[PDB]
């Protein structure tokens, strides 16, 4: 199986994809996030966070007050299945998680939790 994907994020507040396909055959899956462009992380930082589709906005709202030091995520948030750091231009991060965590028949999505980015920066996770 192919159990890795790389997603780019930009100065114009977008990801380069709207769906991440995860082979159910995979034991673990690795998401690598890169940031093209020139803006630093405190201006236009992006992370990639995976959760239940219905949990994305609640997580993002709870992340606002956490600050960039905690990757704009509330510490110990149980709704977060996996997430990268907040990265700025020229940086990259990756996260590897157990594919078992994704309940078949449940709807999953990815988003950026930097304040206000979720409106433009989200997508679906599809198990294949």
- Nearest alpha carbon to residue 6 among 79, 84, 102: 84
Kindly state the smallest distance separating residue 108's Cβ from its own copies, in Å: 23
Write the CB contacts of 67 (distance below 8 Å, at least 6 apart in sequence). none
Neighbours of 4 (CB within 10 A): 13
The answer to the question of residue 48 lying near its own copies (CB under 8 A) is: no
**80: its two tokens:** 């977060």
The answer to the question of residue 54 lying near its own copies (CB under 8 A) is: no
Residue holding tokens 């988003």?
Answer: 111
Nearer to Cu ion, 100 or 119 (CB): 119
The DSSP element (H or E) to which 122 belongs, if any, is: strand 122-127
Selected binder of its own copies within 21, 43, 54, 103 (CB under 8 A): 43
Selected binder of its own copies within 68, 79, 94, 97 (CB under 8 A): 68
3-state secondary structure of 50: strand
| Residue 65 interaction partner, one of its own copies, Cu ion, Zn ion, none, beta carbon < 5-8 Å per kind | its own copies
Nearer to its own copies, 45 or 109 (CB): 45
Nearer to its own copies, 48 or 81 (CB): 48
Residues in contact with Zn ion by the rule CB under 5 A: 23, 25, 62
């Amino acid at each position: 199986a192919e159990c890795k994907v790389t997603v780019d994020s930009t100065d114009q507040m977008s990801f380069n994809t709207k769906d991440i396909a995860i082979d159910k055959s995979c034991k673990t899956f690795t998401v690598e996030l890169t940031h093209s462009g020139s803006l630093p992380k405190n201006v236009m930082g992006h992370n990639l966070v995976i959760s239940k589709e219905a949990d994305m906005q609640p997580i993002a709202t709870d992340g606002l007050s956490a600050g960039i030091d905690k990757q704009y995520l509330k510490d110990g948030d149980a709704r977060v299945i996996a997430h990268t750091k907040v990265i700025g231009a020229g940086e990259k991060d990756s996260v590897t998680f157990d594919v078992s965590k994704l309940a078949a028949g449940e709807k999953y999505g990815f988003f950026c939790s930097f304040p206000g980015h979720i409106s433009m920066m989200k997508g679906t996770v599809t198990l294949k």
